[PDB]
Amino acid sequence: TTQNPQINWTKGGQAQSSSLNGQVFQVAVGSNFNPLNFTNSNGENIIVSAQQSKNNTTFASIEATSNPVNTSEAGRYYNVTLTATGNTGKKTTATYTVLITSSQKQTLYGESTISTYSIYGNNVLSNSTTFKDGDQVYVSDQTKTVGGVSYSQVSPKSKNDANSSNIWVKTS
């Protein structure tokens, strides 16, 4: 009830209205995982924090009470339990699940420099933005073809960003 600490979380900087308890997140094989601040497979930053109560916005202490997460192997899942403790010792827990997936990123090779383009309707314009050989990016599932050339939309930030970055490379 209302007097217990409240756990808050943001995904991609946006406050979330659904409770952290019960969430299922994807985390990439090989990643460093902190259960209070981590990046999901699609590049969205997830930050968990707490306040004293529903109505009291003062900092409340929060820590992982159970964190067996191991990112070494894809196809495994782990439950994380977080405990928030108010200044008079009331407690709230949330348990979320982490699925270890393979990387959703792709490596750009191109020649050392990869040129980018912006697309509006059926028009391809040059973009000054360049990637270096070896740079890793998320890639939109939706490609676009202009003049029989295929282009992929990309972002180094997130899969979501890649769908609207209007930074395109030639699909290889």
Residue numbers in the entry: 189 to 298, 301 to 362
What does the paper say about this structure?
S-layer proteins (SLPs) are self-assembling, crystalline proteins coating the cell surfaces of many prokaryotes. We determined the atomic resolution structures of all functional domains (I-III from N- to C-termini) present in the three S-layer proteins SlpA_ac, SlpX_ac, and SlpA_amy. The Lactobacillus S-layers are anchored to the cell wall through interaction with teichoic acids (TA), either lipoteichoic acid (LTA) or wall teichoic acid (WTA).
The full-length SlpX_ac shows differences in structure and domain arrangement compared to the SlpA architecture. The middle domain of SlpX, SlpX_ac_II, exhibits a SlpA_I-like domain fold and an additional repeat of the SlpA motif. The four residues observed in the vicinity of phosphates are conserved with the proposed binding motif of YxY….KxxN. These residues are not conserved in the third SlpA-motif, which is present in SlpX_ac_II. However, SlpX_ac_II contains an additional 3rd SlpA motif and an additional loop region, allowing for increased protein flexibility to incorporate into the assembled SlpA-SlpX S-layer. In summary, the atomic structures of Lactobacillus S-layer proteins, SlpA and SlpX, along with the observed differences in their domain organization, enabled us to generate a self-assembly model for SlpA, the main SLP. This model aligns with prior studies and suggests a domain-swapping mechanism that enables the integration of SlpX into the S-layer.
